[PDB]
Structures are given as C-alpha cells and as structure tokens.
C-alpha cells in the first residue's frame, strides 16, 4: 500500500508557540507536483487544501487565516509538515493529514495545548500611609485553574483573597487575581506563586517608598 506515516501522533504545544506537525509519504524521484494532493483538517475545519501545486485559500476556515502554511520545500522530501503560528487553546484537537500520491492514505494527530501562568502583572498600592497598610495584587491568565500562594521574604505563607474569572482577552483561559492586604515597610519583599491545580510561577513584589503626590 501507499501509506502516510506520522513520526508522532501526540504533540504537547505551549500556548503562543509555533508548531510543526509532520505527515511522511513516499517520494522516489522528482515528485509530480500536479498529481500531489494534501489536505489538513482539524475536526470539521479545513486548514490546507493543496491541489495542482497551489493552495485554495477560499476553503480555509477563518480561524486558520494568515497563521497556517504548508512547508512546500519539505514536499520534495516526502514531508507534508503543517506549521501553525501563535497556537491557542482552540487549536487543541485531532488533526488529519490526507495525501494522494500514487494512492491515498490519512493519519490522525492529537494536539494538546499547555497554557501556563508564566506571565504575571503586579501592582502595589498604599491603603493608609499611617498604618503602612498596602494592597499587593498579582494577576495571570492560564489553564486550568490556579491557586495563589503569598509568601513573606522568609517564605512564611500569608493569606490573600483570590478571584477567578473567565478571561475576557481570550477564551477558555482563566484570569486569576489575588490581593494581599498587609502592614509593611519600604524594600520589604513579597512573593506570589501561581500553582496550577490537577508547575509554580513566582513573582517578586518589592514595597516602594510612600508616594508624596497624594491628596488628603
């Protein structure tokens, strides 16, 4: 038989990365580019439709527009590699490559998307300069859900209040917020650790000088 080979059937991919997923098919001498047909699909979405040595863009699902390319140089070496730019959680799923070249076969590939809380926004506001009470806030987005552990500079656990909402900036991604209210002094250090539930990303918060530009 003419058989499409897949060197791996499972890709774990990092949110926002580029992935290349490979279908291997036999090519002996120079390939008849005309004869070659390559389809890539994820579930019901068409990604790549390569026929008569060209792509039909008119048939590609919009969610794969500008971000999906067949590597045409690879085609000569029996390689139907699909590259997807800026991978999101919606790109997780089962991919099929379909090749017709002296016969016709398909293979399934599973893509999983890992979305870590690796990016942490922080904010330190004084609540009352007299008590020296401050509000420390860390936020990050990821999947799945995360707890936030607040630690002192001596790595003792402090109690904060966490708020988990569905991201508005993207989809399926959780937006996690924790704030620590504590009486503290300039140059004291705090850590907030995002710990996914079911990896540990830590930010350093340094207490700044009390601002002198403040109303009564």
């Amino acid at each position, epitope marked *: 038989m003419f058989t499409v080979t897949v060197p791996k059937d499972l890709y774990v991919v990092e949110y926002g990365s580029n992935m290349t997923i490979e279908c291997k098919f036999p090519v002996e001498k120079q390939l*008849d580019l*005309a*004869a070659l*047909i390559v*389809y890539w699909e994820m579930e019901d979405k068409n990604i790549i439709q390569f*026929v*008569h040595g*060209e792509e*039909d863009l*008119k*048939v590609q699902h919009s969610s794969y527009r500008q971000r999906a390319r067949l590597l045409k140089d690879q085609l000569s070496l029996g390689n139907a590699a699909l590259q997807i730019t800026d991978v999101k959680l919606q790109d997780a799923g089962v991919y*099929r490559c*379909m090749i*017709s070249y002296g*016969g*016709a*076969d*398909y293979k399934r590939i599973t893509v999983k998307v890992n979305a870590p809380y690796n990016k942490i926004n922080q904010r330190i506001l004084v609540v009352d300069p007299v008590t020296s009470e401050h509000e420390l806030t860390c936020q990050a987005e990821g999947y799945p859900k995360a707890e936030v552990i607040w630690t002192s500079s001596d790595h003792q656990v402090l109690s904060g209040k966490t708020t988990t909402t569905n991201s508005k900036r993207e989809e399926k991604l959780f937006n996690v917020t924790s704030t620590l209210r504590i009486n503290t002094t300039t140059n004291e250090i705090f850590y907030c650790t995002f710990r996914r539930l079911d990896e540990n990303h830590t930010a350093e918060l340094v207490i700044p000088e009390l601002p002198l530009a403040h109303p009564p």
Partner: nanobody
Amino acid sequence: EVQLVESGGGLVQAGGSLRLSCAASGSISSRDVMRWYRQAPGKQRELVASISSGGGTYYVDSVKGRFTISRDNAENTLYLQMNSLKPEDTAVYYCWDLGHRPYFKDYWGQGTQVTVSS
C-alpha cells in the same frame, strides 16, 4: 463507496474528436477532485487531466490545447472533450475520484478503449 462508469470510447481517425463521459454513483461530492488517466499498451498509466472542486484544471503537456476536462455536479458526470486526435492518444482512459465524504479514498473506473487510426 463510489462507482465510476466510463463511456464514449471507440474508433476515431486522426484529426477526429470525441467526448468521454464518466457517470459517478454513490457517496460523491463537488469537493471531490476527479481525473482522467490513460494507459497505452505496455506503457505506464499516466495522468491526462485533473479538475479540483474550484473548477481549476491541470493537463499533461501532450494534450494541452486539444483536451478539456469538465464536471456536471448535478448529473454526477465527468467529461473529456478530445480534439485533434493523434494515434498516440490510443489508450484505455480511466475515470478517477478522490472521495472525502465517508472516508478519504480514491476510486477507479474499469476504463474505455480509445483507438485513433491513421
């Protein structure tokens, strides 16, 4: 599963013309790509003409400007108009279809003999 039945083959003299027809029955689609191949006696089977879903066509060099592949999706019929026949056009012509609807599969007709007398 799909059946392809080619027709129109026969005896034509050089400079003559004929239309081949392929009737496709079963799990067909306007998204399927279809083709005409031919095999001269003890030569290798070659691709003659190709039509994509988008109606985009490829022709082998030896038939460019003489042969026209077209599709009627309503009647599930593929056509080859063969003009300015030459003796080397003599072959069995096979209809071909790449199915995607149930699964991804290609299907072959049994072929139709074309004989170009000089």
